[PDB]
Design a protein around this ligand. Structure first.
Ligand SMILES: CCCCCCCCCCCCCC(=O)OC[C@H](COP(=O)([O-])OCC[N+](C)(C)C)OC(=O)CCCCCCCCCCCCC
Ligand SMILES: CCCCCCCCCCCCCC(=O)OC[C@H](COP(=O)([O-])OCC[N+](C)(C)C)OC(=O)CCCCCCCCCCCCC
Ligand SMILES: CCCCCCCCCCCCCC(=O)OC[C@H](COP(=O)([O-])OCC[N+](C)(C)C)OC(=O)CCCCCCCCCCCCC
Ligand SMILES: [Ca+2]
Ligand SMILES: [Ca+2]
Ligand SMILES: [Ca+2]
Ligand SMILES: [Ca+2]
Ligand SMILES: [Ca+2]
Lengths: 376, 376, 376, 376, 376
């Protein structure tokens, strides 16, 4: 993830222009290789046409160049890129939305599972650990970074996500499919035992806990679905053919023909097809948007920071259910205890953001005494 | 936020034309700087071409101008702007939808947490204060205006959003990540204590309270997500390249060539490229839509009024849970107590809006006696 | 609202052609003023060019006309209109979806709040009245028609939406923001008192009531949001500039030049630029779609019938919770009491709509005896 | 509804080509009338131009034809059709999604409402009958086919959807608005009586029943909304003007001019403007998509089969709550009772669909011994 | 399903270029037949024009070719394909989202339905078997692969999805509609009996079980809806006409005319219309996206693996509710038991993915001492 939110807070003079000076996650970094190949092919064709070809061969090449330049179209490529890239971007955001966060669940485990004794601590930590374990099992299935960190279940044991007993239980349960679903079943059974054992005081609280846990299960299922059900290969191939064909055609149609022939549109021979290069940056960059986002769990600069998410989730969840269980700041009368209309102050830097309330769009409508009179 | 809802209530003669006379949040305010730079560059090129260049240099420049004007295309730029700006606008509205409002929660805290004594008052105020504190922690993380108002946690203490005890508790819990999640865990634990202490009469009410609070947590998580996971930089760079390249090409391709040469389309030499300037306003304004909305928590005219939202939420939430707790208007027979079909009157100004009921699209279908007879 | 659903039930010969004979909510009614202005400007330019201008001035004007006609483009305008109008239409439907209906809530108030005595009647009527009052407070904030009907809270008292005691309570609670949220807090507190007083038999029923009421609160909050957070002014100005600039350019570029000059495309001098007028109807009508829908709570023909909704909601809600409370039709064996497979008859007019069940797309697949045999 | 799902299961050679041989719900059936009118007008213009017009009149007509053919544009029409038709298709699917199915509710009524005696049977049947009655009241309000089947409430009585007592109760409750909402209030009151009478054992079950019933109410409200709030007439008129104007222009611009004049593009005089006819099929068919779908409750081939849905819902709901109440198949050990990893067999025809599990996209990543070592 | 997620994890040099070397689910496999037919027709026309036609016939053909090449347009086809294919892709993903997974339900059945005795085992297995049976009944109705595996209910009995007693019960209940809904009613009745029999301890747990089961019912209803309510045939025919007409026109308009005539754009006679073939691959591949996805339950390479889903669901669900019922790994202090801030290690391969926390976009804003001072 490359965050530039702070740089685009305001629509300042050349706000997006300044973003062209970025390297990480940039268009430049994504297509410089393809652009260099295109550059080399274009100038190989230029040298061949200018030097190797005979006069008749040069005339045939100049006819082919006019034909190819005539057969370059930007509407179909722009359209298919628009729709395809929009699909990729939509799926990208949906995949972020299906990253499981334990925060809702950990609030409920901290609140509902009772006991400051070692047994209550162990129960709360085990429940939230099952949640984190389910999350990491799916993430190591879909994220290259997470997999490289946990290339085997034994790595999960060494890293403390899974106990040796949990590892042994998983091996006993082995089916020939991804076992990421197991910790949810464990969570449901352990929550039930907690309720039957009196650690959860009422089955409505158990219902809430299982509802939050199942929300996480649905998110994990969606991550599995996106990882398994790729955008149909035929669609990806169609967009790829459109782009690569446009520029293969440009390799001949955008050659600078010999000025001596004075062909329409070839009066001057600049060596650099600057406009063609700008079209390359635009169209191939547009395609690189999809190439980066199609699998957002890879190692691209703008792929999701899955390892950070795993670490943060573990730290926060264990703190929430263990140290923060019935550990509250003292409850005392607040600063506005007997102030009907509290008005927190503004800083010198923030004074300009104090606003009057918007009362509704009708607030300023003017009506005469007669207009406002009720009729029988 | 620039509200013009009242000005566009009706589709009146030149309804949108009148909006062109607005300055705050206007296209003019957003691109006048870029337009002045473009204006200066265009006329520098004009003066250089007209005065400095020799006859041969002028002919070469006139060839380059014809080439550049030939290589100006509006379909790719319009397409990429359409899709990109639509993405930005969608994310903009989603970010508004993830601004947390305490209204649902405060109704439940006012209703369910019992006691007119000082302890009940303190409990209700503390719960709703935890909600407001969570909200402000995330908002100061994502909103420049809120941050400038609360540039440190100590500012939150001075402003009355957090007690000194709450501040000390937060410092004790410090992890190397944003601690905006803490007040939710506090809320869950305090609600649990209220239930165990008899201030909440039934665990179903506790379940409802925690459900509303967790809804707010999800909204805050979404604000964090949008602040962290920018639109991929490559996409922003692609759109920026498209626009800036179009107009860099225009800087040469839209020059008024010497009329004496009588080039096709250069018969008359107007000094102002009015059409090019209109295209600038259109395309760069379209891009400025995204530039303003990409981070709606900045200080642009049309960015969200986060400080007002924080102040209003605090005032309303404290009033709802403290002064309005079991404080109801007298319950008395309404004006339509024994009126089967109440017909509230209309004013002279509103009489034209009295309507007959729409009974359904089938209501006026005509059928003969034979057509309506049931068959065996 | 102009309903034409019945007229377009079937795809009949010239189904949409017949809709061009409509006046109310029509394109004609929305742009005739702008079209007349455009008509007058076009013919003023025609008369000036034909009569006032000298021969040299006429030649300069004919050059400018060719230039302007060359610089007319329909792709950018069509694109920006497509995206902008789609945004407006989406927001329009979302605003309809956020109009609160009390039907779900009134079913629960009728069912759950017990007692045929005067106290039960008063309690049910007061609860549903709080719902209707919240609805009308927001609607009078966002709807010009509702505001003109209720230009002050005292009008709400005279119309029977609010009691004098409720009015006094509201004035006591006054904060410098829209108080539309107050009746929800009152509802929560009154429902709690009903439960504690035994009128609501179980807290799960209280939970359901408050859930439905909070759904209405969220809808009202969305109405407030749409009324406050306009589509960014810059976007509206961009689309407006695109359209108005297209047609300002047409005012010169679409002039009929003197036939004697035999300019390419000006061989014949028709006086009416019929195609330009059709383009005006199309593009300015497309923009008028947005101009009407951008604020659907105004007084346009196709704005929502908010006053009718308020009246109907009041009548239905009071009937549902008061007259229909435990007032059921006699429960008796239905016509199909001992008929395993009930087959309600068809009329002569409806006989053609009797269908066989669709059993699924696989139902007709043919397989040989060998194909259907299970393998080991 | 024309179902062709089975015909397009696979992407076979000319899969969509074979669909052009369909008549019911076809493009041919929808526009043959308009196409015949267009055909007649085109050839009337041809005959007039070829025979009636004088030489000078023919030259004027040939100039007008060149002008009109120059002023034919396909981008605006394609754009506006794309956006408008997409809106219609979206609303079409949303309307299908708002067709109420009693299946969830009928499972809960079958399970929760106890008693195999006549009273329990009557209670279950009455509750599910109220659901079906609400559904049919709205459907007869919005569906021409349903209305023609039930053109009066008395028809609902004769068809067995409503008892005479229910009819009398409805007439007593009459307000000047659609009464489709009444059966929900009856359902809520009858469910409450069932709970108070001990037929529903616990208020949580009552809560579930009312939640499912209210889901159906929301769906019915959406059907009402779509029936009432048409797509704004101005938008429909805009698209209609675009299409009809394109083809009115084609009526002159696509005439075959006299070959003797050798106009550019009129060298050969084919009598049939085949390309213009293909454009007619395309554009007018695209518009006919909207014309059919704009009201999907009419009698078009591809309108919804509302009568079938009503009949099926009645049959299934009554069977589910009456015959299937506590009528279960014997519970016995399944075929895989002591089989840890059940492997149901495949047929000869299905053997090729047996697959290995997809274990996740990371499953095949290769790492060296050093790469997989944890670091301190 | 063709999964290529692992191949597109990163935006590597020619990432999408490498996907053009795929056969299964490829563009090549989907249109080679149509392309061969197009190839044969094009060269038959070439041979006829070059050999059979006389000089006058050749001149007429050359005029028709110029006319046809003039009448080839790519904007309407690209537009209609964009919108239509987007609709198909949206419906495709929605259909995947409506594939029922028993995981949420099986967690609740494993947790809530008590007893390690044979009766508890039978009850849990029967409940989850009803869920799987409902799923398979709908899937065999909509999926050709599933149907070919289970071409009759007796096949479901032989495969162990349904007992002989369940089969007999289904035959007794037979109505003239798809009976896929029956197992939900059985589930509701059996869950109710379990609660009344004490196997489910509290009606809130029963409520949760039925809520999850009804979610599955809604998904199955959606699968039925998509299978029944095809995309309107007229829309499919419109897109098909656009594509097939474009290429039928190309069959004449893209012929290589005799070079001796030196027609504009026919200077050189290449035999292969390479650009036309690329346009074929692009446009017909784009259409093949829809042709494959329109029914994603067929046997295409990229259709869903329904049989695998059925097998996996059965195996996992039975394991979860039977072997894993109250079978938990030992609960023991985790590796971070007394570690406030757990820091799981990284591998050598994963060290580069360790990140600092993103604290929010405001974290780096700089303010002076005066700017941060609160004002009165
Ligand atoms: C060929 C592909 C397009 C590439 C674009 C090349 C232009 C330069 C982009 C790099 C901007 C450097 C930003 C910077 O480091 O400086 C910061 C300065 C404050 O902010 C500014 O630069 C304010 C100036 C903003 C740009 C000028 C206004 C735009 C006018 C229309 C375009 C024609 C003008 C030549
Ligand atoms: C003018 C508007 C367009 C109308 C289209 C006219 C073409 C004929 C459409 C009717 C298809 C008849 C299908 C059929 O009953 O037969 C079934 C046969 C197996 O399936 C097949 O027909 C396989 C052949 C599929 C078509 C040929 C491949 C497409 C190649 C590009 C188009 C140019 C080829 C002329
Ligand atoms: C006519 C329809 C378009 C068809 C496209 C034909 C081009 C060849 C596609 C097949 C790629 C083979 C991939 C491969 O097996 O090799 C793997 C190699 C590492 O990865 C690479 O091939 C890296 C090279 C990536 C392509 C060259 C850079 C793109 C530059 C713009 C296009 C113009 C260049 C000719
Ligand atoms: Ca990636
Ligand atoms: Ca901003
Ligand atoms: Ca309006
Ligand atoms: Ca229809
Ligand atoms: Ca398929």
């Amino acid at each position: 993830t490359i965050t530039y939110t702070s740089q685009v807070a305001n629509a300042r003079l050349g706000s997006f222009s300044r973003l062209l000076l970025c390297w990480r996650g940039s268009i430049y970094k994504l297509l410089y290789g393809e652009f260099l190949i295109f550059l080399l092919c274009y100038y190989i064709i230029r040298f061949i046409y200018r030097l190797a070809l005979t006069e008749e061969q040069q005339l045939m090449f100049e006819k082919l160049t006019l034909y190819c330049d005539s057969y370059i179209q930007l509407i179909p490529i722009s359209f298919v890129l628009g729709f395809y890239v929009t699909l990729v971007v939509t799926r990208w955001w949906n995949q972020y939305e299906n990253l499981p966060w334990p925060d809702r669940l950990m609030s409920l485990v901290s609140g509902f599972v009772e006991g400051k004794d070692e047994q209550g601590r162990l129960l709360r930590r085990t429940l939230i650990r099952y949640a984190n374990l389910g999350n990491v099992l799916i993430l190591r299935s879909v994220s290259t970074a997470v997999y490289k960190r946990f290339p085997s279940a034994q790595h999960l044991v060494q890293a403390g996500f899974m106990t040796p007993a949990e590892h042994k239980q998983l091996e006993k349960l082995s089916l020939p499919h991804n076992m990421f679903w197991v910790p949810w079943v464990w969570f449901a059974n352990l929550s039930m035992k907690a309720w039957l054992g009196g650690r959860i005081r009422d089955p409505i609280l158990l219902q809430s806990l299982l509802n939050e846990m199942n929300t996480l299960r649905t998110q994990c299922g969606h991550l599995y679905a996106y990882d398994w059900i790729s955008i149909p290969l035929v669609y990806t191939q169609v967009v790829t053919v459109a782009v690569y064909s446009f520029f293969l055609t440009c390799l001949v149609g955008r050659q600078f023909l010999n000025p001596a022939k004075a062909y329409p549109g070839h009066e001057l021979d600049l060596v650099v097809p600057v406009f063609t290069f700008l079209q390359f940056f635009f169209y191939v960059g547009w395609l690189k948007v999809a190439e980066q986002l199609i699998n957002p769990f890879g190692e691209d600069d703008d792929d999701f920071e899955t390892n950070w998410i795993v670490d943060r989730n573990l730290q926060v969840s264990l703190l929430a259910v263990d140290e923060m269980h019935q550990d509250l700041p003292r409850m005392e009368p607040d600063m506005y205890w007997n102030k009907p209309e509290p008005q927190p102050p503004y800083t010198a830097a923030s004074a300009q953001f104090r606003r009057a309330s918007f009362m509704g769009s009708t607030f300023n409508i003017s009506l005469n005494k007669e207009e406002m009179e009720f009729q029988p």
